[PDB]
Amino acid sequence: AAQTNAPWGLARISSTSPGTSTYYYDESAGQGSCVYVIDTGIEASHPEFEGRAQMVKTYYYSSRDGNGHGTHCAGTVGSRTYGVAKKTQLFGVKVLDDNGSGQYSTIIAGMDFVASDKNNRNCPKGVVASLSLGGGYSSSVNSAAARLQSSGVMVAVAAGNNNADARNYSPASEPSVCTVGASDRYDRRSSFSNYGSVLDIFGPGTSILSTWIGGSTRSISGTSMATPHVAGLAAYLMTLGKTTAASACRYIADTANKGDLSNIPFGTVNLLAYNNYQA
Known part of the structure; x- marks a missing residue:
């Protein structure tokens, strides 16, 4: 129902005004849904996941998150203290090394793995892919995200932290994703x-408290940290029956707090992720 002294980002997507500290959410909490965190992996043994995180694939020497990025974003997606969808199931797809840098061919393979792996998983409510990465533009990277999106995954991607138009970044610039x-x-x-026309929605992404590796917590910033809020939000909304995977992105845009954000350049949407929860 409510999480007192939640991280500011969780409290934000649950209210129209800023400055609040409580996260209001339906009891559903993303149950029955699944989110594929495609990053540095997840420290599944973090007790903030309560066994609901599991590595399903890696592209490196081991499955462990030696970085912290993936378990942070997994935590924002669905840790029960720092998660939007506190009851969602999280799958770890390690396409990024412990240094936080992978190849596009690896990121692409990860996206097509998820597009097929979801078929051997139970997700009666829907499937999300929080894709907290990004690089320069690539049609094939863009193509993989669109393939992932058309396969029935609601794909959330970060605009990138370059303070530029996201049109020059992938899979940030793929139109069909979020x-x-x-x-x-x-x-x-x-x-x-980043900003621009391809952006669909804004997420809390500055100074974001979430889980870390070693059983710790950490506060970090980046659009990489904003997309877990949206992907968690989509996992939350999908569970509530508000939207499908292929429509959640434009749903979050229609129900977003509109016009609240300053320093939004003309052409970029002034929408902010919002669960519109009535208690």
Whole structure:
């Protein structure tokens, strides 16, 4: 129902005004849904996941998250203290090394793995892919995200932290997915956050408290941290029966807090992820 002194980002997507500390959410909490965190992997043994995280694939020497990125974003997606969808099932897809840098061919293979792996998983409510990465433009990277999107995964992707138009970044520039920009605690666009027309929605992405490796917690910033909020939100909304995978992105845009964000350039949408929860 409510999470007192939640991280500011969870409290944000649950209210129209900034500055709040409580996260209001339906009891569903993303149950019956699944989110594929495609990043540095997940420390599944973090007790904040309560066994609901599991590595399903890696592209490196081991499955462990030696970085922290993936378990952070997995935590924002669905840790029960730092998660939007606190009851969602999380799958780890390690396409990024422990240094946080993988090849496009690896990221692409990860996206097509998920597009088929979901078929041997139970997700009666729907399937999300939080894709907290990005690089320069690539039609094939863009193609893999679109393939993942058309396969029936609601794909959320970060706009990138270059403070530029996201049109030059992939899979940020793939139109069919959900290109998420980063906001800050005071309803400003994050200083690093990319923008542009391809952006669909903005997520809390500055100073985001979430799980870390080693059983720790950490506060980090980036559009990489904003897309878990949206992917969690989509996993939350999908469970509630509000939207499908192929329609959740434009659903979150229609029900977003509109016009609240400052420093939004003309042409970029002024929408902010919002669960519109009535208690």
